[PDB]
Design an enzyme around this catalytic site. Structure first.
Site, PDB file in Angstrom:
ATOM      1  NE  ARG A  98      -2.478  11.818 -14.516  1.00 51.27           N
ATOM      2  CZ  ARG A  98      -1.697  11.767 -15.377  1.00 51.27           C
ATOM      3  NH1 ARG A  98      -0.445  12.399 -15.359  1.00 51.27           N
ATOM      4  NH2 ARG A  98      -1.930  11.161 -16.703  1.00 51.27           N
ATOM      5  CG  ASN A 130      -9.226  10.352  -5.782  1.00 54.58           C
ATOM      6  OD1 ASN A 130      -9.806   9.824  -5.049  1.00 54.58           O
ATOM      7  ND2 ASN A 130      -8.024   9.891  -6.430  1.00 54.58           N
ATOM      8  NE  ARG A 161       0.372   4.326  -2.807  1.00 52.36           N
ATOM      9  CZ  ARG A 161      -0.272   5.091  -3.603  1.00 52.36           C
ATOM     10  NH1 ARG A 161      -1.210   5.824  -2.853  1.00 52.36           N
ATOM     11  NH2 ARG A 161       0.132   5.533  -4.677  1.00 52.36           N
ATOM     12  CG  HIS A 185      -8.854   7.411  -1.429  1.00 49.03           C
ATOM     13  ND1 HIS A 185      -7.820   6.472  -1.329  1.00 49.03           N
ATOM     14  CD2 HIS A 185      -8.796   8.288  -2.593  1.00 49.03           C
ATOM     15  CE1 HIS A 185      -7.110   7.077  -2.449  1.00 49.03           C
ATOM     16  NE2 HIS A 185      -7.725   7.790  -2.963  1.00 49.03           N
ATOM     17  CB  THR A 240      -0.206   6.788  -9.075  1.00 53.95           C
ATOM     18  OG1 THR A 240      -1.511   7.135  -8.908  1.00 53.95           O
ATOM     19  CG2 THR A 240       0.560   7.695  -7.967  1.00 53.95           C
TER      20      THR A 240
HETATM   21  N1  LIG Z   1      -7.085   4.605  -4.819  1.00 50.36           N
HETATM   22  C1  LIG Z   1      -7.831   5.550  -5.604  1.00 50.36           C
HETATM   23  O1  LIG Z   1      -9.043   5.740  -5.663  1.00 50.36           O
HETATM   24  C2  LIG Z   1      -7.068   6.482  -6.942  1.00 50.36           C
HETATM   25  C3  LIG Z   1      -7.774   7.184  -7.725  1.00 50.36           C
HETATM   26  N2  LIG Z   1      -7.275   7.796  -8.587  1.00 50.36           N
HETATM   27  C4  LIG Z   1      -7.768   8.764  -9.653  1.00 50.36           C
HETATM   28  O2  LIG Z   1      -8.335   8.081 -10.766  1.00 50.36           O
HETATM   29  C5  LIG Z   1      -8.580   9.198 -11.948  1.00 50.36           C
HETATM   30  C6  LIG Z   1      -7.935   9.307 -13.360  1.00 50.36           C
HETATM   31  O3  LIG Z   1      -6.465   9.244 -13.136  1.00 50.36           O
HETATM   32  P1  LIG Z   1      -5.438   9.491 -14.327  1.00 50.36           P
HETATM   33  O4  LIG Z   1      -5.923   8.280 -15.146  1.00 50.36           O
HETATM   34  O5  LIG Z   1      -4.157   9.521 -14.078  1.00 50.36           O
HETATM   35  O6  LIG Z   1      -6.160  10.730 -15.021  1.00 50.36           O
HETATM   36  P2  LIG Z   1      -5.758  11.135 -16.599  1.00 50.36           P
HETATM   37  O7  LIG Z   1      -5.726  12.275 -16.974  1.00 50.36           O
HETATM   38  O8  LIG Z   1      -4.832  10.074 -17.073  1.00 50.36           O
HETATM   39  O9  LIG Z   1      -6.955  10.113 -17.195  1.00 50.36           O
HETATM   40  C7  LIG Z   1      -8.584  10.244 -17.200  1.00 50.36           C
HETATM   41  C8  LIG Z   1      -8.904   9.938 -18.803  1.00 50.36           C
HETATM   42  O10 LIG Z   1     -10.162  10.106 -18.582  1.00 50.36           O
HETATM   43  C9  LIG Z   1     -10.761  10.583 -19.871  1.00 50.36           C
HETATM   44  N3  LIG Z   1     -12.089  11.280 -19.852  1.00 50.36           N
HETATM   45  C10 LIG Z   1     -12.334  12.383 -19.457  1.00 50.36           C
HETATM   46  N4  LIG Z   1     -13.433  12.820 -19.528  1.00 50.36           N
HETATM   47  C11 LIG Z   1     -14.296  11.586 -19.997  1.00 50.36           C
HETATM   48  C12 LIG Z   1     -15.574  11.177 -20.212  1.00 50.36           C
HETATM   49  N5  LIG Z   1     -16.621  12.191 -20.284  1.00 50.36           N
HETATM   50  N6  LIG Z   1     -15.807  10.117 -20.296  1.00 50.36           N
HETATM   51  C13 LIG Z   1     -14.632   9.195 -20.872  1.00 50.36           C
HETATM   52  N7  LIG Z   1     -13.506   9.436 -20.392  1.00 50.36           N
HETATM   53  C14 LIG Z   1     -13.201  10.496 -20.232  1.00 50.36           C
HETATM   54  C15 LIG Z   1      -9.502  11.397 -20.415  1.00 50.36           C
HETATM   55  O11 LIG Z   1      -9.777  11.846 -21.652  1.00 50.36           O
HETATM   56  C16 LIG Z   1      -8.576  10.843 -19.948  1.00 50.36           C
HETATM   57  O12 LIG Z   1      -7.973   9.846 -20.871  1.00 50.36           O
HETATM   58  C17 LIG Z   1      -8.302  10.540 -11.177  1.00 50.36           C
HETATM   59  O13 LIG Z   1      -9.398  11.193 -10.567  1.00 50.36           O
HETATM   60  C18 LIG Z   1      -7.238  10.228  -9.839  1.00 50.36           C
HETATM   61  O14 LIG Z   1      -7.289  11.104  -8.825  1.00 50.36           O
HETATM   62  C19 LIG Z   1      -5.980   7.875  -8.890  1.00 50.36           C
HETATM   63  C20 LIG Z   1      -4.998   7.157  -8.179  1.00 50.36           C
HETATM   64  C21 LIG Z   1      -5.487   6.341  -6.898  1.00 50.36           C
HETATM   65  O1  LIG Z   2      -5.744   9.437  -4.407  1.00 45.68           O
HETATM   66  C1  LIG Z   2      -4.821   9.392  -5.210  1.00 45.68           C
HETATM   67  C2  LIG Z   2      -4.660  10.265  -6.164  1.00 45.68           C
HETATM   68  C3  LIG Z   2      -3.330  10.754  -6.535  1.00 45.68           C
HETATM   69  C4  LIG Z   2      -2.892  12.040  -7.155  1.00 45.68           C
HETATM   70  C5  LIG Z   2      -3.078  12.354  -8.433  1.00 45.68           C
HETATM   71 CL1  LIG Z   2      -3.372  10.733  -9.518  1.00 45.68          CL
HETATM   72  C6  LIG Z   2      -2.665  13.486  -9.036  1.00 45.68           C
HETATM   73  C7  LIG Z   2      -2.493  14.591  -8.075  1.00 45.68           C
HETATM   74  C8  LIG Z   2      -2.420  14.397  -6.810  1.00 45.68           C
HETATM   75  N1  LIG Z   2      -2.131  15.451  -5.701  1.00 45.68           N
HETATM   76  C9  LIG Z   2      -1.773  16.843  -5.842  1.00 45.68           C
HETATM   77  C10 LIG Z   2      -1.003  17.381  -7.182  1.00 45.68           C
HETATM   78  C11 LIG Z   2      -0.843  18.549  -6.972  1.00 45.68           C
HETATM   79  O2  LIG Z   2      -1.035  19.143  -5.754  1.00 45.68           O
HETATM   80  C12 LIG Z   2      -2.332  19.155  -5.109  1.00 45.68           C
HETATM   81  C13 LIG Z   2      -2.884  17.806  -5.351  1.00 45.68           C
HETATM   82  C14 LIG Z   2      -2.727  13.139  -5.923  1.00 45.68           C
HETATM   83 CL2  LIG Z   2      -2.718  12.859  -4.523  1.00 45.68          CL
HETATM   84  C15 LIG Z   2      -2.208   9.644  -6.437  1.00 45.68           C
HETATM   85  C16 LIG Z   2      -2.517   8.491  -5.472  1.00 45.68           C
HETATM   86  O3  LIG Z   2      -1.594   7.581  -4.923  1.00 45.68           O
HETATM   87  C17 LIG Z   2      -3.730   8.516  -4.680  1.00 45.68           C
HETATM   88  S1  LIG Z   2      -4.017   7.310  -3.379  1.00 45.68           S
HETATM   89  C18 LIG Z   2      -3.731   8.253  -1.972  1.00 45.68           C
HETATM   90  C19 LIG Z   2      -3.734   9.613  -1.822  1.00 45.68           C
HETATM   91  C20 LIG Z   2      -3.392  10.332  -0.771  1.00 45.68           C
HETATM   92  C21 LIG Z   2      -3.220   9.582   0.496  1.00 45.68           C
HETATM   93  C22 LIG Z   2      -3.182   8.146   0.348  1.00 45.68           C
HETATM   94  C23 LIG Z   2      -3.281   7.643  -0.734  1.00 45.68           C
HETATM   95 CL3  LIG Z   2      -3.772   5.576  -0.877  1.00 45.68          CL
END
Ligand SMILES: NC(=O)C1=CN([C@@H]2O[C@H](COP(=O)(O)OP(=O)(O)OC[C@H]3O[C@@H](n4cnc5c(N)ncnc54)[C@H](O)[C@@H]3O)[C@@H](O)[C@H]2O)C=CC1
Ligand SMILES: O=C1C[C@H](c2c(Cl)ccc(NC3CCOCC3)c2Cl)CC(O)=C1Sc1ccccc1Cl
Ligand SMILES: NC(=O)C1=CN([C@@H]2O[C@H](COP(=O)(O)OP(=O)(O)OC[C@H]3O[C@@H](n4cnc5c(N)ncnc54)[C@H](O)[C@@H]3O)[C@@H](O)[C@H]2O)C=CC1
Ligand SMILES: NC(=O)C1=CN([C@@H]2O[C@H](COP(=O)(O)OP(=O)(O)OC[C@H]3O[C@@H](n4cnc5c(N)ncnc54)[C@H](O)[C@@H]3O)[C@@H](O)[C@H]2O)C=CC1
Ligand SMILES: NC(=O)C1=CN([C@@H]2O[C@H](COP(=O)(O)OP(=O)(O)OC[C@H]3O[C@@H](n4cnc5c(N)ncnc54)[C@H](O)[C@@H]3O)[C@@H](O)[C@H]2O)C=CC1
Ligand SMILES: O=C1C[C@H](c2c(Cl)ccc(NC3CCOCC3)c2Cl)CC(O)=C1Sc1ccccc1Cl
Ligand SMILES: O=C1C[C@H](c2c(Cl)ccc(NC3CCOCC3)c2Cl)CC(O)=C1Sc1ccccc1Cl
Ligand SMILES: O=C1C[C@H](c2c(Cl)ccc(NC3CCOCC3)c2Cl)CC(O)=C1Sc1ccccc1Cl
EC number: 1.1.1.27
Lengths: 324, 325, 323, 328
Positions: A98, A130, A161, A185, A240
């Protein structure tokens, strides 16, 4: 003989390779939501899961495997070794956790991307991790894949959203509420007010103050709420999953089925809107079997263009200091 | 006039009472998986979420709400107050926590849940998931005062779902085409019905008489043992179970909402059957429609299979008679 | 005891009222495609079929009934008596043979009162041509409010337009946005201003869009919508699949209360200078109450004129109809 | 610079071979029902239609094409030339024409197949053939012989619709959904089909165990009538509406699902049953088959009674008698 041999007569026994394989790298909160969303949409005939944490990986795989009766995906495999990913049509990167975030994930990708290309060299990469726009570039650079086969989630969730919020405001389903959030993004995303419409009726034409601070109805808040909500869900839930899981599955649908639908995804924008540096930004893209085959040339205002250039400049500044 | 008034002319300012409404009580690991599986299967026109932890509850609701574009469920609501549940067709209880302690703990929780559910949705169908599912289905039935048909317990639905997967792997045939029935008490004390185990109507016990016996050269008893072992293994590996149970609950919801009249292995009032004379809920194949369990399949059980169901019933009643409501 | 009694123990044998019922009136080429499209989209828990030809009606019902294993609709019933329609949420009129005004009215004079008799709180979806005139006829006979009387109108017209636009641009019809409004058929209006892909106005990029000075002749995209309709009739003798799918899409919005915008025929009195009780296609929000709201599309003087002319033409026929 | 060039920037023109293609040969009543069922089940990324009647074929194609907005199949093509079928995973033959004898029909459809099958193999050599045209059991052999394809890639509809109709009737009798009512109709598709009463169950509870006179002439509840009604209904729908489309269309689509998705589900389909139940001739009969990406990879060895076995042997003998007198 055995009961299987007694009950069933075998015609052929070659362990045939899959036709529509999807790989999810990082069985995290996001990764697992993408997995279930893909499984329920019946997009793959084989699902492969990859993670560093072997115990969680096995457990997540087994849990999905037990739901097989209610699914139309006959093979759910997992492994720390990328041999399980071999011949994937689409590989989704939801790995990591995260500038530190950038640096940390770049090192993770240094291993992930070469391993993915090694087993699935003609796959489509869908980056979710991210900063998605920066990591899409990282993936594209390491893979050496053409710009079409490197797809970043970008402003897909942002627009998803936005259309929900717009939908609530107007009391119309998000499907019928059309709006486009493009560029970088996250916080630096751009709401394209000109494109905001319902049934081809431009909201900016009916309400000229749309998106301005002058606006008595505060429609600029619809975009602000997209950003606010993201951090709010994190404050409330800690993560999320559902919204991103569904959005990634929607992209996967257009890719796997070669639908040729337009989506707001991060792509090589270098050469558009005056951008010169090798940076990835979200624009409306035609998603088919070859990934981003075509790009929609959105008419942007001087203000909108400036924002995309500033995002590009910011993103390049980080990208040029990255050691692969 | 506002942009909404300028763009849209209103014919009627609505609003009908919810028609195909589903409520999920306890937005936990299980609850949220049931929620997504229901949403993706397009079973409800309104989804209501209830929990004690308001922050998590709001978060989970908002996350689902953002995915609305990719869903065909127009209203996703949540709240600590059960006013949000009003006019539900099906109410699913996935509340409490993971893990006699779990019994008296969850009984105390149900003492508030069930009266509040009945208060807002008096003609609903209750689907109990929270463990011990067989004991808590009785608890719900007793507190609600609902007829036996409108009180449905998950029971051996997941057990049979896991069994059909394992059987499926063993035979190299899809779980859909591999037929088997796990009945009785959900969990460790579940009963594999070896007589019913078949593929294309071909009885496996007829071809292999040693099926589910100690002398089994192929050790088919292990297929049922693995159902129990796997449950604890997934808990050891990831810490919880969500996807498998989420999908199974959604499948039951489909037959209930659509009035399909399909047969499912679910926990129901087994008094008057298999020599059981007590108010106990055990899993048997049930016809699931718009009125819940309208009919039940009278499975021919062996003296050993019957004995296990009676022992489960005796054990379960012993706890149930000492419970305070 | 019977094998049924031996195998199954009964808890209750009561009630059984249909929660999500759909009725198809006129099991013709159009009617039957609507039926299959609805069944496969899992929109109803009960499907009722009504026709004058009892043999065809039984045959169509039995054929659907045999496919029950592959469907998630547990009850498929039929009958010449409208008692089979009782407690329908949505009633679709695809009745009366294809080419027409005065003939179908006499058919409706009996269909509509019988429908209202068994399903008084239903939503009417008129498909029978002239759809715009017959939606009025239904609304008048039923005495139902404006919202519960929905006409197919320019839904198929826009569906055909988005396909043609889609082919021209090499983009899926879902992503190609365009609106065909007004009188269904030949007298339909292509709204060039609303034509877009990803919110990018085609008329902004190409100002000659849908004019005579258009070197790419985009006005042909609308002409082809009309030409294709008659071509399919020349080639296979009827139209079923395209209309069947479009009607099912409307049904989805209604049954699921989606509140999606669709190009459907509704009472247009009060809009675009129309003062007469006429039904024309405009973008409508479709839900559990039918047309709850309508989108006020900004039309050009020429576009408005066409809708007024259609309204004038349609009223001229409608005022001479005996009720 | 056209509006398309102004609106859309192209990255690549790279047109690839269709990944999940399905071909329907014979856009008749059956063929078109299979087409719509397949389209709505989102099984193909490309649908190809072939017929001799060019006008009907263009009209059917255009009608489906107009419905594209409500479908998830981006390419619907048609043509009298089999070049349109190229790279099809599954090819379905519904090409025929339903007061004529059964022998006239055989050689009539064999003349038709003499052109269809070589043309199909020419453009899609690694496809799976799904025969629907009647007599399905005889024509599946005809296709297999002409194609030179292995046993597994030649699939006949057989008793799929028969079992589908049986499960509906059983379902009505018991007031349980056909999905939960399990029964198997095997052997020769049509009148000479075999109801396997041993396999007839609900929740693994054998109906023949509870009711020993099940399917016999002794039968007090006359359950043998459930199978008789499968045959009677077929002719009744023909008497009433003139054809059958919806039931067969859905059944064919269900088989296509297992094939396209490689589900490995068991289905009652016509396959070469040589060396089984004492049959020694090259004949195709319906047995429960595991349907995957390679077609019939495995078959279920159903325990049949002496009477059930005899019926399958008699069907095999009858079918071979016609098949040995056929020209290829
Ligand atoms: N709209 C968007 O583009 C969004 C992007 N994200 C992003 O998605 C990413 C993942 O988020 P979460 O799943 O909540 O994180 P998390 O902490 O739940 O999961 C990440 C997973 O990746 C694994 N991992 C770590 N290193 C690895 C490797 N070398 N090979 C394979 N797996 C590995 C970890 O063991 C863990 O299970 C974050 O970077 C987050 O910011 C989240 C929400 C929206
Ligand atoms: O990119 C992400 C990653 C996000 C997330 C995750 Cl999975 C985990 C952490 C954060 N932020 C914080 C938490 C602590 O304080 C600094 C950073 C965010 Cl923002 C969860 C999420 O919804 C999105 S989409 C988005 C993010 C910002 C603006 C608009 C959109 Cl659509
Ligand atoms: N086959 C079956 O029947 C299965 C049953 N289960 C059971 O499901 C239950 C839930 O499991 P998990 O979700 O993993 O637990 P959990 O710890 O993730 O979630 C329980 C949730 O219920 C909430 N809750 C507690 N008291 C409440 C109240 N008074 N009202 C509303 N919500 C309340 C908690 O805040 C929490 O969010 C357990 O009892 C578990 O044993 C699990 C797997 C299979
Ligand atoms: N976009 C649109 O609005 C479209 C509308 N249509 C229209 O749909 C209608 C039906 O077309 P087809 O099915 O091809 O015609 P058809 O000739 O195939 O079918 C009409 C059916 O209605 C039955 N019928 C007649 N009187 C009846 C009565 N009193 N009650 C019940 N059923 C009755 C007939 O027996 C017949 O089965 C036509 O009016 C046609 O113009 C067709 C295509 C598109
Ligand atoms: N369970 C089963 O196996 C069932 C099989 N069937 C069979 O399906 C077949 C088709 O039935 P219907 O569609 O109702 O017949 P039909 O008369 O409606 O259609 C047959 C179509 O095939 C076309 N055709 C003829 N020669 C052709 C050729 N050389 N190449 C391509 N197309 C050609 C015709 O032009 C016509 O459009 C029949 O043999 C019928 O008995 C029907 C019902 C169930
Ligand atoms: O009922 C459940 C609840 C279960 C669970 C959960 Cl959600 C949480 C925890 C546990 N174990 C432990 C934890 C601490 O030490 C005692 C009990 C289990 Cl066993 C997780 C799970 O899979 C099932 S289904 C099942 C359980 C046992 C046998 C067969 C089946 Cl089908
Ligand atoms: O309204 C209809 C009814 C139509 C049809 C049917 Cl179902 C039956 C017949 C015809 N025409 C002819 C047939 C022979 O010569 C006289 C009349 C038409 Cl045109 C089939 C059809 O496609 C539509 S929609 C439409 C019609 C005209 C322009 C644009 C559109 Cl979208
Ligand atoms: O094979 C078919 C083809 C059939 C059909 C069609 Cl499409 C057309 C005609 C006939 N019969 C006769 C009627 C007039 O004189 C010649 C032949 C049949 Cl029987 C329509 C149909 O339902 C089936 S399935 C079936 C057929 C017989 C018994 C059991 C089953 Cl399950």
């Amino acid at each position: 003989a055995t009961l299987k041999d007694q009950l069933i007569y075998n015609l052929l026994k070659e362990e045939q390779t899959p036709q529509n394989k999807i790989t999810v790298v990082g069985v995290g909160a996001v990764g697992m939501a993408c997995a279930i969303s893909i499984l329920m949409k019946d997009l793959a005939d084989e699902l492969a899961l990859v993670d560093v944490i072997e115990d969680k990986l096995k457990g997540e795989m087994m849990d999905l495997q037990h739901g097989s009766l209610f699914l139309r995906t006959p093979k759910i495999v997992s492994g720390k070794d990328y041999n399980v990913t071999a011949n994937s049509k689409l590989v989704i990167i939801t790995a990591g956790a995260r500038l530190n975030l950038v640096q940390r994930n770049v090192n993770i990708f240094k291993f992930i991307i070469p391993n993915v290309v090694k087993y699935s060299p003609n796959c489509k990469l869908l980056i979710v991790s991210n900063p998605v726009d920066i990591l899409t570039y990282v993936a594209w650079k390491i893979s050496g894949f053409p710009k079409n086969r490197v797809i970043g989630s970008g402003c897909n969730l942002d627009s998803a959203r936005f259309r929900y919020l717009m939908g609530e405001r107007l009391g119309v389903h998000p499907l019928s509420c059309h709006g486009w959030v493009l560029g970088e993004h996250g916080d630096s995303s751009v709401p394209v007010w000109s494109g905001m419409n319902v049934a081809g009726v431009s909201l900016k034409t009916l309400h000229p103050d749309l998106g301005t601070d002058k606006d008595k109805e505060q429609w600029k808040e619809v975009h602000k709420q997209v950003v606010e909500s993201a951090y709010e869900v994190i404050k409330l839930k800690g993560y999320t999953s559902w919204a991103i899981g569904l959005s990634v599955a929607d992209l996967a649908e257009s890719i796997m089925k070669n639908l040729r639908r337009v989506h707001p995804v991060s792509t090589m924008i270098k050469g558009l809107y005056g951008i010169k540096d090798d940076v990835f930004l979200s624009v409306p893209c035609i998603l088919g079997q070859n990934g981003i085959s075509d790009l929609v040339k959105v008419t942007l205002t001087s203000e909108e263009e400036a924002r995309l250039k500033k995002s590009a400049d910011t993103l390049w500044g980080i990208q040029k200091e990255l050691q692969f």
